[PDB]
Scaffold this motif. Structure first.
Motif, PDB file in Angstrom:
ATOM      1  N   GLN A  27      19.688  34.061   0.755  1.00 54.41           N
ATOM      2  CA  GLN A  27      18.450  33.381   1.146  1.00 54.41           C
ATOM      3  C   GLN A  27      18.050  32.358   0.094  1.00 54.41           C
ATOM      4  O   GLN A  27      18.131  32.619  -1.109  1.00 54.41           O
ATOM      5  N   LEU A  28      17.628  31.187   0.554  1.00 56.38           N
ATOM      6  CA  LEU A  28      17.121  30.168  -0.342  1.00 56.38           C
ATOM      7  C   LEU A  28      15.692  30.540  -0.714  1.00 56.38           C
ATOM      8  O   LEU A  28      14.797  30.500   0.133  1.00 56.38           O
ATOM      9  N   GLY A  86      11.714  22.325   2.374  1.00 59.20           N
ATOM     10  CA  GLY A  86      11.321  22.638   3.730  1.00 59.20           C
ATOM     11  C   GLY A  86      12.204  23.703   4.335  1.00 59.20           C
ATOM     12  O   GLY A  86      11.942  24.168   5.437  1.00 59.20           O
ATOM     13  N   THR A  87      13.257  24.094   3.624  1.00 59.13           N
ATOM     14  CA  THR A  87      14.171  25.132   4.120  1.00 59.13           C
ATOM     15  C   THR A  87      14.092  26.437   3.317  1.00 59.13           C
ATOM     16  O   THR A  87      14.923  27.329   3.504  1.00 59.13           O
ATOM     17  N   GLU A  88      13.096  26.555   2.438  1.00 59.53           N
ATOM     18  CA  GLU A  88      12.865  27.803   1.709  1.00 59.53           C
ATOM     19  C   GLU A  88      12.668  28.934   2.704  1.00 59.53           C
ATOM     20  O   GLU A  88      11.882  28.803   3.641  1.00 59.53           O
ATOM     21  N   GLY A  89      13.395  30.029   2.503  1.00 59.49           N
ATOM     22  CA  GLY A  89      13.345  31.183   3.404  1.00 59.49           C
ATOM     23  C   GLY A  89      14.518  31.276   4.366  1.00 59.49           C
ATOM     24  O   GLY A  89      14.745  32.326   4.976  1.00 59.49           O
ATOM     25  N   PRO A 123      20.719  29.458  10.869  1.00 57.59           N
ATOM     26  CA  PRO A 123      19.412  29.254  11.500  1.00 57.59           C
ATOM     27  C   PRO A 123      18.363  30.299  11.091  1.00 57.59           C
ATOM     28  O   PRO A 123      17.164  30.004  11.116  1.00 57.59           O
ATOM     29  N   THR A 124      18.824  31.494  10.710  1.00 60.91           N
ATOM     30  CA  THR A 124      17.953  32.625  10.368  1.00 60.91           C
ATOM     31  C   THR A 124      16.932  32.285   9.284  1.00 60.91           C
ATOM     32  O   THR A 124      17.287  31.837   8.198  1.00 60.91           O
ATOM     33  N   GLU A 125      15.660  32.494   9.605  1.00 65.34           N
ATOM     34  CA  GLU A 125      14.583  32.359   8.641  1.00 65.34           C
ATOM     35  C   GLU A 125      13.907  33.713   8.464  1.00 65.34           C
ATOM     36  O   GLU A 125      13.841  34.506   9.403  1.00 65.34           O
ATOM     37  N   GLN A 126      13.396  33.967   7.262  1.00 67.89           N
ATOM     38  CA  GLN A 126      13.015  35.315   6.856  1.00 67.89           C
ATOM     39  C   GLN A 126      11.986  35.286   5.731  1.00 67.89           C
ATOM     40  O   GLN A 126      11.989  34.357   4.928  1.00 67.89           O
ATOM     41  N   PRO A 127      11.105  36.305   5.656  1.00 66.72           N
ATOM     42  CA  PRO A 127      10.203  36.444   4.501  1.00 66.72           C
ATOM     43  C   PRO A 127      10.950  36.444   3.162  1.00 66.72           C
ATOM     44  O   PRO A 127      12.047  36.993   3.069  1.00 66.72           O
ATOM     45  N   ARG A 128      10.357  35.821   2.146  1.00 65.36           N
ATOM     46  CA  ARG A 128      10.952  35.772   0.810  1.00 65.36           C
ATOM     47  C   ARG A 128      10.359  36.861  -0.078  1.00 65.36           C
ATOM     48  O   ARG A 128       9.149  36.902  -0.312  1.00 65.36           O
TER      49      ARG A 128
END
Length: 150
Positions: A27-28, A86-89, A123-128
């Motif tokens: 994850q970024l 803009g792609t963090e997470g 594509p997956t975005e997620q809580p950091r």
């Protein structure tokens, strides 16, 4: 329905005795240094298209600093705007990389970091989730000092 999990890999990769064979998902967490696209022709505007991107990447357990090589950036095909902010997470696949040693410099102590020569954005975005840096790990710290002594 359950969840599909990614195996942590940072600590094990560094402590391992060989360069990465297979791709690794992470994850970024943060963009430490974003990148600008290479613009052809002379202009008084600053050109920074010979500098890569510096990212903080998490594997769920640890974070690591990733230098995304200019080679990785220029060959990549971008959906949104060029660059990472803009792609963090987002999930990030490191398809071609390597473990490098950075010696102490400009106030900051030595550390292991990754150099990424090829990546894709999933594509997956997620809580950091706040996560310790891999260099805060005792076994890593020990190997760092072994590495420096060469």
């Amino acid at each position: 329905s359950g969840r599909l999990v990614l195996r942590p890999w940072i600590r094990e990769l560094i402590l391992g005795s060989e360069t990465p064979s297979s791709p690794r998902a992470g994850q970024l967490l943060e963009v430490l240094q974003d990148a600008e696209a290479a613009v052809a022709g002379p202009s008084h505007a600053p050109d920074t298209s010979d500098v890569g991107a510096t990212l903080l990447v998490s594997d769920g357990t640890h974070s690591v600093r990733c230098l995304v090589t200019r080679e990785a950036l220029d060959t990549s095909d971008w959906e949104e705007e060029f660059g990472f902010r803009g792609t963090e997470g987002r999930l990030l696949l490191l398809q071609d990389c390597g473990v490098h040693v950075q010696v102490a410099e400009g106030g900051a102590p030595a550390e292991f970091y990754l150099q990424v020569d090829r990546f894709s954005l999933l594509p997956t975005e997620q809580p950091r989730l706040r996560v310790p840096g891999c260099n805060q790990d005792l076994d890593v710290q020990k190997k760092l000092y072994d590495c420096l002594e060469e």
